[PDB]
């Protein structure tokens, strides 16, 4: 009966891609076909921040676009002011192996974590002057790739393994698993209305998931390799993936549908990160090659280079007011764009 | 200029670069090795052997020991999945990878070699290959039950290297069965890189007691092989 | 999506041939290093062979060497193995497998127990 299965699953499948055809009637690239270019963008670095003894993985940009945190490979977390380039906080990490950074909305709590298979939590505002571990959640029998904070009390977590998982924080107990991916789960992006939520895997899919039902709502194919990084969109209707295949494809939760794909024939190297402008119009991407383009996400035409990394490049954000942009790379250095 | 609040500030940040610094003296000091090998090797036995002569689902173990005032860090992977091609990634900065072979399902230990040796971010790393189990290897090809030519049809048409000094009690039979798996594994690593890093083999037993040392001389040429490229003399 | 179709598979005498066809579609074949595995029963997979994306590189393992032909067509979108003078050991279950990133000398985990670019599978034994 395995076969019976097999061949309702493929029929089933065509009258979901025949759908999706169907639904399709004009291409993007044909409605933008009239408004004005986006122009060449100029950017210099404004600030480096330098301290970081190794590599970079993660770094994540504070509420008030003002502080941001970076974790690096030698075992420590530095919570940085940007505008002054002082330094707020250097945490030690019981291990050395991080993967991923993140900044709570409320500014009161960080937390990190990597191979060790742990999600560490960090109080910053203390009765005390010293940065103290206030939870450590391990439920996971991969490795920790990405973790976003939804309030004070709920983390949610991407790992090694397929599955996803949501915690709360106070119990430290795991009240919801995500699972349907097939490989490692990469990157993760949560939506405005703090609702949903995206997922990117090592198995050129992406996944829509619902909070609060915790079930996989679409799934989106177009891509030929494993997915890096998905920074969503700032309306929320669409969001965009980075893969290895030296490609960036923005899709879309209605039209449930590829919509364009940025691409050219000079670039071989792979994706490491993807983050969207304020207005959603300029789309920012790392690559292996040094380098970081900056792409019109209507037009896909490139509009500018971000050169000035030695090593390449493993994270990018922006921040909520969109004043700025911050690049870490492999040579241990932050640089800040304008 | 600056406030009286921003120049406090400011002095803090100061102490805190200087105990950045005092960090970074003892992280240079020290040497990191990742270990690989398979289930069936002596891995687990070969870091149990250094630990005692000097937490359900951790993803990484650590062992700390010392030779000569001198310190090293060993990792191996506990509980990751089978999937190994993003996790690599981590260990593009390590002094040497250790890699052990039960040479006592001999290709894949060569594929993984092969995989290990080509991979881009993986360059510039040497690798130190210990063939576990020889006395095991000594008792198989001893006993004539099983022949290796099945596997590897070559091995017949092959003769001990000239430079080979095989152990005085030893019968040649084994010495030309060790040398053969050992120029296997030396075909690999010969073909490519060209002078950016090398591989150091080993016969070995999982209850050695010599590995230590072993692992000392091989760090020290590699950082004194380096050295010498650098200032343009090599 | 990536997707790898199998074909050509069936029961043979002793000492006879068989060809195996695989179909892709999905991605640029191109760009891509493409392998050979099986997995006896009761066993886990083993790596057979592969061959670059130009064809100029042929790799075989050491039981199967001398006696399978490895080739494949960019062209028509297939690659191609040719099995001459079977034995009764070889009666596994044989796959085509795609290395995961393109342009690249190497490639990881072609053999992992769950594999997202490996094909469905073709079951050929060979038995009097």
């Known amino acids: 009966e395995l076969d019976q299965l097999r061949q309702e699953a493929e029929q089933l499948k065509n009258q979901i891609r025949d759908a999706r055809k169907a639904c399709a009637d004009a291409t993007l690239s044909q409605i933008t076909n009239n408004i004005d270019p986006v122009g060449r963008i100029q950017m210099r670095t404004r600030r480096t921040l330098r301290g970081h003894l190794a590599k970079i993985y993660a770094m994540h940009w504070g509420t008030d676009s003002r502080l941001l945190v970076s974790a690096s490979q030698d075992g420590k977390l530095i919570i940085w002011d940007s505008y002054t380039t002082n330094k707020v906080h250097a945490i030690p990490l019981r291990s050395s192996w991080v993967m991923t950074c993140a900044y709570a909305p409320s500014g009161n709590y960080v937390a990190c974590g990597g191979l060790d298979n742990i999600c560490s939590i960090y109080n910053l505002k203390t009765r005390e002057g010293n940065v103290r571990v206030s939870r450590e959640l391990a439920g996971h029998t991969g490795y920790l790739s990405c973790c976003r904070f939804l309030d004070d009390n709920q983390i949610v977590t991407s790992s090694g393994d397929t599955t996803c998982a949501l915690w709360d924080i106070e119990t430290g107990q795991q009240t919801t698993t995500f699972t349907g991916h097939t490989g490692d789960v990469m990157s993760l992006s949560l939506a405005p209305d703090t609702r949903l939520f995206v997922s990117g895997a090592c198995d050129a899919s992406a996944k829509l998931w619902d909070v609060r039902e915790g079930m996989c709502r679409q799934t989106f194919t177009g891509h030929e390799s494993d997915i890096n990084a998905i920074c969503f969109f700032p309306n929320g209707n669409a969001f965009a993936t980075g893969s290895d295949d030296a490609t960036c494809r923005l899709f879309d939760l209605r039209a449930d549908q590829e919509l364009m794909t940025y691409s050219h024939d000079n670039i071989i190297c792979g994706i490491t990160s993807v983050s969207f402008s304020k207005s959603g119009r300029l789309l920012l991407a790392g690559y292996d090659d040094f380098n970081c383009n900056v792409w019109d996400a209507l037009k896909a035409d490139r509009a500018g280079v971000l050169a000035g990394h030695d090593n390449r490049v493993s994270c990018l954000g922006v921040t909520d007011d969109g004043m700025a942009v911050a690049t870490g790379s492999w040579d241990s250095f932050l640089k800040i764009w304008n | 200029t600056l406030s009286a609040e921003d120049k406090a500030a400011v002095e803090r940040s100061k102490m805190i670069e200087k105990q950045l610094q005092k960090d970074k003296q003892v992280y240079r000091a020290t040497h990191r090795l990742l270990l690989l090998g398979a289930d069936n090797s002596g891995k687990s036995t070969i870091v149990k052997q250094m630990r005692i002569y000097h937490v359900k689902t951790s993803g990484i173990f650590e062992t700390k020991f010392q030779v000569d005032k001198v310190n090293f860090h060993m990792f191996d992977v506990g509980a990751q999945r089978d999937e190994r091609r993003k996790w690599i990634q981590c260990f593009n900065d390590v002094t040497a990878i250790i890699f052990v072979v039960d040479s006592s399902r001999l290709q894949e230990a060569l594929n993984d070699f092969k995989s290990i040796w080509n991979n881009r971010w993986l360059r510039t790393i040497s690798v130190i290959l210990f063939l576990n189990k020889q006395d095991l290897l000594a008792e198989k090809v001893l006993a004539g039950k099983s022949k290796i030519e099945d596997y590897f049809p070559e091995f017949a048409r092959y003769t001990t290297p000239e430079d080979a000094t095989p152990e005085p009690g030893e019968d040649p039979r084994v010495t030309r069965a060790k040398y053969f798996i050992r120029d296997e594994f030396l075909r690999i690593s010969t073909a490519s890189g060209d002078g950016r890093h090398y591989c150091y083999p080993h016969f070995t037993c999982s209850v050695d007691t010599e590995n230590a040392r072993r692992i000392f001389n091989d760090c020290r040429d590699i950082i004194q092989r380096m050295h010498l490229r650098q200032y343009e003399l090599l | 999506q990536v997707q790898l179709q199998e074909s050509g598979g069936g029961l043979v005498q002793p000492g006879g041939s068989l060809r195996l066809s695989c179909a892709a579609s999905?991605?640029?074949?191109?760009?891509?290093?493409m392998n050979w595995v099986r997995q006896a029963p009761g066993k886990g997979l083993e790596w057979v062979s592969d061959?670059?994306?130009?064809?100029?590189?042929?790799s075989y393992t050491g039981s199967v060497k001398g006696r399978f032909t490895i080739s494949r067509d960019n062209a028509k979108n297939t690659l191609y193995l040719q099995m001459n003078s079977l034995k009764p050991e070889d009666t596994a279950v044989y796959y085509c497998?795609?290395?995961?990133?393109?342009?690249?000398?190497?490639?990881?985990?072609?053999?992992?127990?769950?594999?997202?670019?490996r094909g469905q599978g073709t079951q050929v034994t060979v038995s009097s």
């Open positions: 999905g991605f640029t074949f191109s760009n891509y290093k």
């Open positions: 061959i670059s994306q130009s064809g100029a590189s042929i």
């Open positions: 497998a795609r290395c995961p990133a393109p342009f690249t000398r190497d490639c990881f985990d072609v053999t992992s127990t769950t594999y997202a670019y």
